Amino acid sequence: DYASLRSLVASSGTLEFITEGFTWTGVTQNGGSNACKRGPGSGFFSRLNWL
Amino acid sequence: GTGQAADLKSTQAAIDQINGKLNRVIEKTNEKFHQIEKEFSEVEGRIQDLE
Ligand SMILES: *[C@@H]1O[C@H](CO)[C@@H](O)[C@H](O)[C@H]1NC(C)=O
Numbered sequence: 001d002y003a004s005l006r007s008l009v010a011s012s013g014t015l016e017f018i019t020e021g022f023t024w025t026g027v028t029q030n031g032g033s034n035a036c037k038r039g040p041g042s043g044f045f046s047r048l049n050w051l
Numbered sequence: 052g053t054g055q056a057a058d059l060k061s062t063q064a065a066i067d068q069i070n071g072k073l074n075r076v077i078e079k080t081n082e083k084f085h086q087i088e089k090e091f092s093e094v095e096g097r098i099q100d101l102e
Contacts, residue, residue: 004096 017047027051 009015031050032042044050087102 008094
């Protein structure tokens with residue numbers, strides 16, 4: 001449902017992202033990949049956390 | 052002396068014209084029953100934006 005998401009974000013008019021304190025116990029946070037090279041080396045979706 | 056009197060036929064001719072269009076404007080109002088929803092509760096996207 002890519003069309004429905006693109007419309008509601010467009011009607012919102014704000015990409016404001018408030019980071020919250022999620023307690024991920026027992027899993028490794030902040031995974032990176034080769035295709036998502038950000039800056040020097042591997043990077044991540046800025047608003048997503050890979051467990 | 053001085054008198055005043057109205058002409059019935061000319062006044063009636065004007066009233067017959069206006070009453071004719073007054074009927075033309077309020078005649079047979081559309082009758083609609085089960086339609087679509089127009090006020091919505093939460094975001095839905097593609098279908099909601101079209102509704
Ligand atoms: C974006 O969201 C809010 C702006 O109100 C702020 O608290 C947060 O630090 C911002 N972060 C970035 C990366 O711009």
